[PDB]
């Protein structure tokens, strides 16, 4: 029904970007919102659109937002260690690894991610989240964890590639619960909820064959029943559209997906 | 009515991005679609979402789209000069400035822009589009400012990069990408010559300014004076559809003074 939780931005533009002001010759970044307005701790665990790629070493590419410079390349490359104790976005302060010579309002994204440092040589576990600042005391804390429902149902994640090496040499896929277009649509059109879940159909737009049926829970995640030990929904083609079939109860038994 | 024109992508993700195969040790990038698919030259001037930041030098960053690397930093920095005759996206090939060490499928965006080279010191004019190497043309039709003292209204976003005047590097736009995605999703038919949009402050429900949306897909207004216009309007407002209007609908001028 369309209330973003945690640090979900409305649009893709402010999705993984962060903005802040840093003093010259210092590595502390005082976070602000993407539009430049001051960030409030009690609003959210982090400024809207703050990255949540946990268990990895960020590598940012900041730049001065007003673009005062006239000659040189404005891209400044630094790295952030979310496992470090100084990584406290809830307190509107994160410390970069390297000092930045020029002070000013900096805006940047995550360029690539490496396996986390000072963490026993663990792999880039994109399914975990960085330990934000102390949020139990404040009203705004992390969004509740989405546990997988029973009835042999598994949460379906949408995977996109981020640059950066991983210990296994596998593609670096960042999983997400819902596509950002769906989140924007839900935010814009705040339709109410009439059932414990929404029965989505993954249908090929042209051939109109029902590739598989998915349940959309009000918490904002898609679940499915894999057919067997096979990967299940991963075999599905990407040229498909989810169509809302009906409102269903929680105990609805999905037809197994995949072969 | 939700019909994209030119190299317009549906979602923001495929904006200012390009994917292609380049042989090791070379500098020519053979463009493909963003999803690793062959690109049809006849359908579009360029692969979907290919940048149109013309009259400026692109400084791209690239990485292999399957992460086959376990050790080193995957981003490779290169530059593309659109004014060069070798920059021909229509023929699915653009040549980077520097050589690329290892071959493979590289995805990449525009990291920053600099004033165009080989142009007599011209500034980074973002109001022009690259040549695209077209040879009939399937480009999006050029939008002209209508008469009746109407001027097209553009939306500006900052891309990093220097400019000859030290001013913000704001790129113009015709319609926010969320509007484009909504139009594509909701193929609402056009029932009038133009759509009158009210710019309403959500908290106070006050129409700060009124705008005309043309079926071509661009938003126009009427400035109160040469020194004012939509720039004074607060950014927190939301466009609310009001009615279908004829081309001769005379808007109330926006701005002050």
């Amino acid at each position, epitope marked *: 029904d369309g209330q973003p939780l945690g640090t979900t931005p409305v649009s893709v533009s402010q999705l993984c970007k962060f903005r802040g002001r840093i003093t010259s010759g210092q590595r502390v970044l005082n976070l602000t919102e993407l539009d430049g307005s001051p960030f409030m701790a009690f609003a959210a665990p982090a400024p809207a659109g703050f990255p949540d790629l946990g268990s990895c*070493d960020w590598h940012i590419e900041m730049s001065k937002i007003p673009n005062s410079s006239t000659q040189n390349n404005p891209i400044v490359t630094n790295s*952030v260690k979310p496992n470090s104790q100084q990584f406290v976005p809830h307190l509107s302060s994160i410390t970069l690894d390297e000092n930045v010579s020029s002070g000013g309002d900096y805006i940047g994204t995550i360029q690539w991610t490496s396996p986390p*440092s000072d963490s026993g040589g663990a792999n880039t576990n994109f399914w975990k989240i960085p330990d934000y600042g102390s949020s139990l005391a404040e009203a705004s804390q992390l969004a509740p964890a989405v546990y997988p429902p029973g009835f042999n149902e598994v949460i379906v994640y949408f995977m996109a590639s981020i640059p950066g090496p991983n*210990q296994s040499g596998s593609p670096n896929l960042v999983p997400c619960l819902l596509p950002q277009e769906y989140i924007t649509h839900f935010i814009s059109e705040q339709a109410p909820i009439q059932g414990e879940a929404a029965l989505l159909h993954y249908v090929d737009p042209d051939t109109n064959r029902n590739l598989g049926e998915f349940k959309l829970y009000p918490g904002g995640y898609l679940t499915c029943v894999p057919n067997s030990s096979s990967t299940g929904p991963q075999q599905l083609p990407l040229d498909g559209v989810f169509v809302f079939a009906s409102w269903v109860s929680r105990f609805y038994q999905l037809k197994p997906v995949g072969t | 009515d939700g019909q994209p024109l030119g190299t317009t992508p549906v979602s923001v993700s495929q904006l200012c991005k390009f994917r292609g195969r380049i042989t090791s040790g070379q500098r020519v990038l053979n463009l493909t679609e963003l999803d690793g698919s062959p690109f049809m030259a006849f359908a579009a001037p360029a692969p979907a979402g290919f940048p149109d930041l013309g009259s400026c030098d692109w400084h791209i960053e690239m990485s292999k789209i399957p992460n086959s690397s376990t050790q*080193n*930093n995957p981003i490779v920095t290169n530059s593309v000069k659109p004014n060069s005759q070798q920059f021909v996206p229509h023929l699915s090939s653009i040549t980077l400035d520097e050589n690329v*060490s290892s071959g493979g499928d590289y995805i990449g965006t525009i990291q920053w822009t600099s004033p165009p080279s080989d142009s007599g010191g011209a500034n980074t004019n973002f109001w022009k589009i690259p040549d695209y190497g077209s040879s009939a043309s399937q480009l999006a039709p050029a939008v002209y400012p209508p008469g009746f003292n109407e001027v097209i209204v553009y939306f500006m976003a900052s891309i990093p990069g220097p400019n000859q005047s030290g001013s913000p590097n704001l790129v113009p736009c015709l319609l926010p990408q969320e509007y484009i995605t909504h139009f594509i999703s909701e193929q609402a038919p056009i029932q009038g010559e133009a759509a009158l949009l009210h710019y309403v402050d959500p908290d106070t429900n006050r129409n700060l300014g009124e705008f005309k949306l043309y079926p071509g897909g661009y938003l126009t207004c009427v400035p109160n004076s040469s020194s004012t216009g939509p720039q004074q309007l607060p950014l927190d407002g939301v466009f609310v559809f009001a009615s279908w209007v004829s081309r001769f609908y005379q808007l109330k001028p926006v701005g002050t003074a």
Partner: antibody
Amino acid sequence: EVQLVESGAEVKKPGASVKVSCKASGYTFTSLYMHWVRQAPGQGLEWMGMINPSGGGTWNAQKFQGRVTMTRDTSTSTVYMELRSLRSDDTAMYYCARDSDQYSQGLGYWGQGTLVTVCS
Amino acid sequence: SALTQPASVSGSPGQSITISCTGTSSDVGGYNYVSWYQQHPGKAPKLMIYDVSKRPSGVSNRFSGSKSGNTASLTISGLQAKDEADYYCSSYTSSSTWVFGGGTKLTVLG
């Protein structure tokens, strides 16, 4: 042209800690990972770990786990190797080597080598 | 651990020689990145073969490495004296570490 040079040959009393540097120039420091390779006289090459020039990121072999401590300096574009409790077998030809290419993933560009010596 | 390698293999000039590097599945078989090396006794080692069969610029086309199951092999054709050096194989282990081979010896008896 890109080359790696290091501190030089050192002589150390076993039980202390040795400090080895590796000057890097002619390329973007943070772009390429730096590895450390040792070769004992008459023995094969050994790999004592890797250092990410971009913000720490140390991964070292289990047989040398807890023994080596590697850090980098972004200002001087120099990577530091620190090994404590040197033993009789620890004397070796200490090489710092970056990869030939970002996507090559093979040590192609090696240093001149440093000779830490142990007698005991 | 360390890749098991032959202690020394020799061949006369003219007849191509093949040196094989052996390891477990986690070392060589699991991952496609194996690097083949060669070290002049006084000079620093450089790169012959990387990514199983890909060759960096600056080394002659005669060198060619391959991976066969759990065993990786390097082929040298038409040997001369300048190839007399120890060859080292290295593979990316499953422990997120690079592990070097034992170190083989080749001497041209001509």
